[PDB]
Every structure is written in C-alpha cells, then in structure tokens.
C-alpha cells in the first residue's frame, strides 16, 4: 500500500516535532566585548572658540 510521491513533494520543507532541547550556543562563542558607552547630552558651544593659536573665535 505504498504511493509514489508526486513531483515537487520530496523537496518540501517539513516541520519536525522532537524532544531534543535547542542548543543554547552551537558555535561555542565567547563573551562579546562591551562596546564604547554612548554619546550623551546636548551640544554646547566650544569654550573660547577654536582655541587655535591667536584666534579668539
């Protein structure tokens, strides 16, 4: 009582119901380093301008 699969059936993406737990870290990755914190606060004008040699702004 076997029915041969039709065209386009054996190439289907099928669901699988299993009991094996999903691996937490299959790549065995390390701990990612902490990034640079942030840019915080509002922008205030530069103190005493450019402060480049004799220029006052």
């Amino acid at each position: 009582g076997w029915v041969r699969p039709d065209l386009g059936e054996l190439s289907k993406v099928t669901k699988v119901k299993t009991d094996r737990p999903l691996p937490e870290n299959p790549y065995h990755s390390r701990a990612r380093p902490e990034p640079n914190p942030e840019a915080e606060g509002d922008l205030k004008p530069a103190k005493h301008g450019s402060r480049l040699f004799f220029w006052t702004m």
Binding site: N36, A39, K47, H48, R51
Partner: protein, 69 residues
C-alpha cells in the same frame, strides 16, 4: 588731558584680569585636549580614532547546504 583722553586705572586692571583668566582657561584646555587625544589614540575606547570594522549585518544566517556550516 586725563579727563578727556584716558580712563581710570581700575578699568585696565579689571580688563587685564579678565584677559588673564581667559588665557589661563585656554591653556588648561589645550593641555587637557592633548592628554585626551594621547589617551584615546593609545586605548581606542573613545569617540575619536575609531577605525571601521566589518559590519555584522553582512553575514548570512541561513542553512549553508552542509550540516557543519
């Protein structure tokens, strides 16, 4: 002559006091900026001297046609 052409000495006194304060703050800021630049170029954890890396959004997290990878 003093009444018509010149002013009191307190005016020049306070003016040069303000000028001295401004220049002292500028000198301190310049030294602090040099130190900050040195430290952040040595360590690289600051906003400046950040060199680009490879974006992680380019990686493809899909089946790769082989089980291992």
């Amino acid at each position: 002559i003093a009444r018509t052409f010149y002013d009191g000495p307190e005016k020049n006194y306070e003016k040069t006091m303000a000028i001295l304060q401004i220049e002292a703050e500028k000198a301190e800021l310049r030294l602090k900026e040099l130190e900050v630049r040195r430290l952040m170029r040595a360590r690289g954890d600051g906003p400046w001297y950040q060199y680009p890396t490879i974006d992680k959004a380019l990686i493809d997290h899909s089946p790769k046609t082989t089980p291992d990878n």
